[PDB]
């Protein structure tokens, strides 16, 4: 997998919507609770993501949020290639809701439980103690010099 | 250190912008919030720390940074509490592309985009976005 490729998936919990962006090559994630899966919120999410990483391609679930012209215009402004219906990360959702379960009682609000879960996902040593965490792998893959 | 950040408040069009600058690179993140609260600050710092390896944050000395919710976030994340060069710069950029968007929010994240991806200097230059990942990739050795 190439360095510029992300998967976007929504997940739902307690009646709220979590947008998740998974860096394919590394397994790094970031995520936010938004009110609902609208064009505006998706567009805003993508734009934040693309301001921080060098995002070339997005694979989406082709939900109606991604087919809106708001998102299309966000992706064109950022020069992101949007690839609707293209699969690959579904485990990513079951994993994330799992970690959210483990921290949920340390937060007043779900949204804080989601970020704590992101943090924990991104810092976990994958494959023993000789390994690298998702946050380490992304910076390794993306680094140009 | 790969791990030192400065966090700053900025006010325009009546809303508040929270700006984090990675000191060694000039890389920024920013979130637009209704008010400068302990809740939003903590939340912002938690997003920040889930993404980058944040060790120390330098802050103005507002009460938003000293609530117990911020200290619990900073204790949980292992963060220690303690240039305007990339702050006047953010303001400048928001104003050059502001017309391109209705909501302040959206121009803020456009301006963060533009700032993080702008190559500094000629051929041989780097963007702030590249400097941060290079600095941290180097440090992971």
């Amino acid at each position: 997998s190439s360095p510029g490729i992300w998967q976007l998936d929504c997940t739902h919990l307690e009646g709220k919507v979590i947008l998740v962006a998974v860096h394919v090559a590394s397994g790094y994630i970031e995520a936010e609770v938004i009110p609902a899966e609208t064009g505006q919120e998706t567009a805003y999410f993508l734009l934040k993501l693309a301001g921080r990483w060098p995002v070339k391609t997005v694979h989406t679930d082709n939900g109606s949020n991604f087919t809106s012209t708001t998102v299309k215009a966000a992706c064109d402004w950022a020069g992101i290639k949007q690839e609707d219906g293209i699969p690959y990360i579904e485990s990513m959702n079951k994993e994330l809701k799992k970690i959210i379960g483990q921290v949920r009682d340390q937060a007043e609000h779900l949204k804080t439980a989601v970020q704590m879960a992101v943090f924990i996902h991104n810092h976990k040593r994958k494959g023993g103690i000789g390994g690298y965490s998702a946050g380490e792998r992304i910076v390794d893959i993306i680094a140009t010099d | 250190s790969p791990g030192i950040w400065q966090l700053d408040c900025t006010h325009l069009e009546g809303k508040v912008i929270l700006v984090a600058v990675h000191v060694a690179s000039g890389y920024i993140e920013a979130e637009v919030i209704p008010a400068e609260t302990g809740q939003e600050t903590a939340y912002f710092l938690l997003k920040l720390a889930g993404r980058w390896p944040v060790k120390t944050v330098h802050t103005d000395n507002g009460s938003n940074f000293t609530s117990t919710t911020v200290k619990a976030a900073c204790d949980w994340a292992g963060i220690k509490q303690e240039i305007e060069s990339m702050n006047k710069e953010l303001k400048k950029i928001i104003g050059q592309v502001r017309d391109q968007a209705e909501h302040l929010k959206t121009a803020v994240q456009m301006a963060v985009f533009i700032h993080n991806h702008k190559r500094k200097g000629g051929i041989g230059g780097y963007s702030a976005g590249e400097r941060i990942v290079d600095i941290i990739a180097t440090d992971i050795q």
Partner: peptide
């Protein structure tokens, strides 16, 4: 456009 067309 950029958040609400044009």
């Amino acid at each position: 456009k950029x958040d609400n067309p044009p």
